[PDB]
Design an enzyme around this catalytic site. Sequence first.
Site, PDB file in Angstrom:
ATOM      1  N   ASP A 170     -25.289-170.739   5.500  1.00  0.00           N
ATOM      2  CA  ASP A 170     -25.268-169.920   6.708  1.00  0.00           C
ATOM      3  C   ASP A 170     -25.094-168.473   6.260  1.00  0.00           C
ATOM      4  OD1 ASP A 170     -23.901-168.234   8.714  1.00  0.00           O
ATOM      5  OD2 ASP A 170     -23.838-170.016   9.975  1.00  0.00           O
ATOM      6  N   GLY A 406     -37.299-116.190 -37.557  1.00  0.00           N
ATOM      7  CA  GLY A 406     -35.893-115.856 -37.667  1.00  0.00           C
ATOM      8  C   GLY A 406     -35.352-116.387 -38.973  1.00  0.00           C
ATOM      9  N   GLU A 407     -34.216-115.832 -39.376  1.00  0.00           N
ATOM     10  CA  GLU A 407     -33.612-116.216 -40.639  1.00  0.00           C
ATOM     11  C   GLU A 407     -32.847-117.527 -40.484  1.00  0.00           C
ATOM     12  OE1 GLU A 407     -34.020-114.863 -43.609  1.00  0.00           O
ATOM     13  OE2 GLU A 407     -35.420-113.379 -42.798  1.00  0.00           O
ATOM     14  N   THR A 408     -32.194-117.941 -41.564  1.00  0.00           N
ATOM     15  CA  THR A 408     -31.431-119.177 -41.553  1.00  0.00           C
ATOM     16  C   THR A 408     -30.234-119.062 -40.618  1.00  0.00           C
ATOM     17  OG1 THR A 408     -30.086-118.498 -43.443  1.00  0.00           O
ATOM     18  CG2 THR A 408     -32.152-119.641 -43.902  1.00  0.00           C
ATOM     19  N   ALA A 409     -29.901-120.182 -39.973  1.00  0.00           N
ATOM     20  CA  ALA A 409     -28.761-120.271 -39.060  1.00  0.00           C
ATOM     21  C   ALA A 409     -28.845-119.218 -37.956  1.00  0.00           C
ATOM     22  CB  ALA A 409     -27.438-120.164 -39.822  1.00  0.00           C
ATOM     23  N   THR A 410     -30.046-119.052 -37.406  1.00  0.00           N
ATOM     24  CA  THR A 410     -30.267-118.163 -36.273  1.00  0.00           C
ATOM     25  C   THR A 410     -30.428-118.909 -34.956  1.00  0.00           C
ATOM     26  OG1 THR A 410     -32.576-118.070 -37.009  1.00  0.00           O
ATOM     27  CG2 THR A 410     -31.160-116.191 -37.537  1.00  0.00           C
ATOM     28  N   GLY A 411     -30.177-120.212 -34.934  1.00  0.00           N
ATOM     29  CA  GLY A 411     -30.188-120.973 -33.704  1.00  0.00           C
ATOM     30  C   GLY A 411     -31.534-121.489 -33.249  1.00  0.00           C
ATOM     31  N   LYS A 412     -32.582-121.349 -34.064  1.00  0.00           N
ATOM     32  CA  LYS A 412     -33.901-121.818 -33.653  1.00  0.00           C
ATOM     33  C   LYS A 412     -33.929-123.329 -33.454  1.00  0.00           C
ATOM     34  CE  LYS A 412     -35.413-120.264 -37.466  1.00  0.00           C
ATOM     35  NZ  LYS A 412     -34.322-119.506 -38.139  1.00  0.00           N
TER      36      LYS A 412
END
Lengths: 589, 461, 365
Positions: A170, A406-412
Amino acid sequence: MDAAIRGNDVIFVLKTIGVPSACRQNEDPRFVEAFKCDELERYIDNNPECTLFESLRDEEAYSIVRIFMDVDLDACLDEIDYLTAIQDFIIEVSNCVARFAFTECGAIHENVIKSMRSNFSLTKSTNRDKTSFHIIFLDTYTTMDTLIAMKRTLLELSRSSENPLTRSIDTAVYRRKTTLRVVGTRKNPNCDTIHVMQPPHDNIEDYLFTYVDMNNNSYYFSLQRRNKLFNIAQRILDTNSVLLTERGDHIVWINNSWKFNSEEPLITKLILSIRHQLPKEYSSELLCPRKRKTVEANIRDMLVDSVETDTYPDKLPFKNGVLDLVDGMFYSGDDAKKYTCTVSTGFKFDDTKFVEDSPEMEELMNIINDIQPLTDENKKNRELYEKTLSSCLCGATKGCLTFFFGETATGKSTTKRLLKSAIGDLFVETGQTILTDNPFIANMHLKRSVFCSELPDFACSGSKKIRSDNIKKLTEPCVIINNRNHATIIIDTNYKPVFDRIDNALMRRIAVVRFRTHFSQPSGREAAENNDAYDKVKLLDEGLDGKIQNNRYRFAFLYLLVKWYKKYHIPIMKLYPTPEEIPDFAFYL
Amino acid sequence: KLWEPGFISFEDAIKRVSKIFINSIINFNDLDENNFTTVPLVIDYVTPCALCKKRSHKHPHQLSLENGAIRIYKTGNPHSCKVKIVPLDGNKLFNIAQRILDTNSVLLTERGDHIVWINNSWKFNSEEPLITKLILSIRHQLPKEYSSELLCPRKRKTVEANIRDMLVDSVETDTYPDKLPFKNGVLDLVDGMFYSGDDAKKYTCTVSTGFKFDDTKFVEDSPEMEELMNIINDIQPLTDENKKNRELYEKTLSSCLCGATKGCLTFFFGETATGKSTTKRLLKSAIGDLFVETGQTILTDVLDNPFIANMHLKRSVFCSELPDFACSGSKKIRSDNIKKLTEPCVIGKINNRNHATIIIDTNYKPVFDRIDNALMRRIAVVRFRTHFSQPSGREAAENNDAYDKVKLLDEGLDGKIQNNRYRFAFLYLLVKWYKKYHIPIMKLYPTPEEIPDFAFYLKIG
Amino acid sequence: KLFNIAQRILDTNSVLLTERGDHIVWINNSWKFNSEEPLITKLILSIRHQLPKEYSSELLCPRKRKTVEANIRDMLVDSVETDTYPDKLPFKNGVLDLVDGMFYSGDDAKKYTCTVSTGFKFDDTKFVEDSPEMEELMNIINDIQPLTDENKKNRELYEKTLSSCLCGATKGCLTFFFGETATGKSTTKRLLKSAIGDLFVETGQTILTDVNPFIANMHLKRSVFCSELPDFACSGSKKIRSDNIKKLTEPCVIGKINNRNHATIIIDTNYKPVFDRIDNALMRRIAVVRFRTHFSQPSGREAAENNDAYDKVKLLDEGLDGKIQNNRYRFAFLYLLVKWYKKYHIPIMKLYPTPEEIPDFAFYL
Ligand SMILES: Nc1ncnc2c1ncn2[C@@H]1O[C@H](COP(=O)(O)OP(=O)(O)NP(=O)(O)O)[C@@H](O)[C@H]1O
Ligand SMILES: Nc1ncnc2c1ncn2[C@@H]1O[C@H](COP(=O)(O)OP(=O)(O)NP(=O)(O)O)[C@@H](O)[C@H]1O
Ligand SMILES: Nc1ncnc2c1ncn2[C@@H]1O[C@H](COP(=O)(O)OP(N)(=O)O)[C@@H](O)[C@H]1O
Ligand SMILES: [Zn+2]
């Protein structure tokens, strides 16, 4: 999970049938009352003549209830056949409820099966000539609206099974303000047929579906989201759910998305899927595989006009719908099927995170202001960066290639990771072979952003130069056997690129965005500010990455991209080259 | 009108109910849409009754309509006969298919493939679909009126078609990284608990080591455990100089049990007869099919390729004998792979999941064509400095500066480890180290200060 | 009685057989053609209305409809050729005559077995003559090629070459769009493809310097363009190898190894190419198109007025490219092409080569 969600030891009971809700909300002593287990125990012991109908106070806070069912068969069964029927009934129902929970509530199927089949309580009606009982699953708790959703699946289960106990389920009891006869009381004062408790459950506490006492053996889940065959074929085509594409394959509309028939055929899946929204006198016929293939053949033979796919470049498709770029409105349903979207980012669009404020959007503004400072010197570079990233949301042909220098450790790399976490599968990384040298170009089809990475300083010896013939070939709208090119192509460079041949058509297909902010280690931070290649030095954050791969900033960056696009590429999308930055082009200049 | 002709033509329903009654029906003609719930069904009991199996019935039967079905019940004494039910909606094969899906024994993954639950393990095949094998296996878990008709092959093909056409939405598989799947269950690593049966079902593990787990060997004491410590103590001395290398070795060994993406690539560096291939064989014997040996192609030959597609869901890939890439006539490591082999999804169905620890053994310090700062972050190296040489040439090895100890070679270890003698004791060691390091977090740290090529960059710094 | 239905369907003559071994069906006013998915069944459903109801009832069941199409397949014996009319433009909603300007939409177009199409529906309200678009289009054509006394033979050969892109036969000559930069060669390509729809194709330089999807894709096309020949006159370049030029002119091109050449081959270049050998058969298959109008920026405009390779310099219009990619000039340029074709290639279509413009041919001259 709050205390009321943790458990509800106080129970509410009515005394008759048809009590109006006005009296209930007025706590009328003649009808409603509140008790505990012990209080109701002495009440029913002392006053057997009364009729007691236990239920909830209100559905707003106490929606959690034990799963319960009422079975009413107009017959009598001997004990052994009764046991066989009850075993088959319990296995089928436990399976069905667990499967519904798995497919809707997202719970674990096996946990539900264990919790339900492990412990349940059965009542017994004194009416000898009828088999009436109430089954209550002690250890399984679910919200009321989930049961309201599950009443359907139980209806088809009852209509499908042959077992008399299962056939006599039900399902009408599943509705708001549900009252169930408490075991030991009469149905009505004129009826002497009551319910009898059963072993091994000798405590009344095992016979109430609202008494919530969640222990280690308990599991909880809730609903997450709150001739004639030719006529069937015409009805299906009227919904406009299946279409023919130019490639000779058919696209079907299942799960609010357009899929391909190149996989195992999906037209039949559609035909089963839409049997519910269709008249039942045909729905009976629709569920035989031969007849379903016949309807599928009719649908194939009625589709003559081939429609082109992915005609809107200004729409961003998700897997739960499509988002308009000019607007901020998101469509989820038949509004999204109008736009023939074939690919998607691969994740659900969340309106709760696509607000604007966001607990993480401020740190996103910090990160973008670190990678690209919003300064008077970083003014044209910043806007070129914004336009280049905005171009990835439009599904049209892009006529320029941007070099991320961009250079190294530039946030790309973090920038690529934000872009991919923001646009899902629409961002793809490609190797250098499409430049210096073909699955690398065939799976680029319908992609909105393609990236190439770590060019190995082609200016020195032992390198194969760019050969801008590729750049000219990657600008044409169709890439060669033919694929549609909707992808913004971005190149990562730590050193300025060199090309073998320089032409007047090359200055119109080259763009460069400069990166000059360094995220250095504390130890090597000093040696970071004696170099002319950096404008700002910031401390390296090791915890940023772990946040990045977790899709933490998925929707805020998407909001930023769409807001920039609403500023730049409306009403026209075009990428402009900046030849004045690469020294190699100065020679002819 | 006592009949609702919304289910089945009344003639067909009467034909069905007559077919149920093997005995001849006396008043078959007068059953119409306006009397079938009223007139008793008088039956000529030439044969035994098809419902009660008795010689005859004292009183005639009767029909009722309820819940879209016909209930057949005897008048007079109810318990003297069995209640019968005639359904009217649904192809019976569709009901069977609904029940089989209802069990959650068959699922589909994102690859457009269908995995089944046969013999306590998620089987899967592409060349030969095996839904029908599942149907045979599961017919025991259904009532008799389904098992009797799951035997004919064409009915099973029909049920398979129904199941195919109802399984729309895809499920995600292999979401638990800290579970080791066998063919007879799943071992939990956080605990020492082993789940065998429907408990292993919840973890959708589509791969297995390939051997059954045994509780009689996985204890701790073991006939083999003590010489297993002896071997591991000899290969890796428990000394203060060779101290850090020891836990680095143990971490690299344990990172082959976790089913997640690994963030580093480990180099086994040692001279000849140092025991690196011994560890290779021990891992292979310990984790069965989860360990795979690949060629040098995935390092020096373009990826996009069976050697890159067979690492799908493997938890350990081991690379053997880099052929002196420092000297001439060799192809370098081409670190683009190092960029590629660590990121979560491997392209090479061109997409595969990466759960593999990549361990490369070498005798010479290798060189890359290009050195980048992203290589600083994902390379670790293990030093092996114990020699297992023959008695003849011990002194010629004891005067070499590349070894800190020389031990007598035992010729019987290879056959014993090949016989999976140390199969479970070594796995126990792996679990102990995993609980020591990888709880609650698994992540690998590089050692840039060890590879000589990275010294020059450090010389730049 | 399904045989009677197949007989009637053949009586309507909607389905036809080709020498390629494939069947073509007249669905929705177009000679639709397919090999992967046969379309006879779709035709049977489409024309089930044009039969007596006792048959229309039976055509619904897919088994009966497959039996009908099997009977149809077994009835057809003789193939019936395909694409024999060169002076017809097959549009998506009919065919346009070239001798007249009359446009057919219905059973009239089915007589001309045209399998390819421009890909777009023809418009009657734009193919008029006057047009707000035609004025600016005619000014653009006047600017690209001045209607002057010196620009008389060059202009007329330009018109002849553009006209021969409408005729569906094999062409007897090749011309080169030779001109300096910013002279409208890309503009001409864009206008031509905007005007002829699907009948255009752009192909690379491989089919010229090499001995192959790039050659079998041009089947029944009416225009092929090759672009940016990379200075073959200087070093580091692969010469023309005119044996391909000989091969591209003969009607049946090898590259299913045979394809019908109904496409005019046009190459737009900035520098005059160098040929491997000069034979007397090469003289009759090379022509020259010259551009001398420079569409320059105001800044470098003066430097363009001191150049000997330019006759006139005009101000560049930046939005014209976006306009022509919008196909706003779609029908006015078609009108111009039709008028020039009716002026030149009636009643005979043949291209006259111009060996006197080639400098490399001068030496043997
Ligand atoms: N705003 C920030 N604050 C702190 N650290 C940051 C920030 N943005 C990025 N980083 C970190 O800086 C490091 C370098 O970022 P990355 O995106 O790899 O740079 P890149 O320019 O692509 N590098 P490279 O490949 O060496 O040229 C990473 O560890 C980032 O997590
Ligand atoms: N009549 C015209 N009025 C305005 N703009 C025009 C006109 N003709 C051409 N242009 C534009 O002027 C530019 C130069 O034409 P274009 O076709 O690019 O020259 P080209 O000689 O083929 N170039 P190149 O490939 O460098 O040798 C383009 O942007 C055209 O759209
Ligand atoms: N602890 C040990 N005791 C005795 N024999 C040992 C040992 N460790 C390793 N061996 C044996 O000495 C050799 C060294 O192991 P192997 O893996 O082949 O060394 P390698 N060539 O890779 O440096 C093998 O033959 C192995 O069986
Ligand atoms: Zn009986």
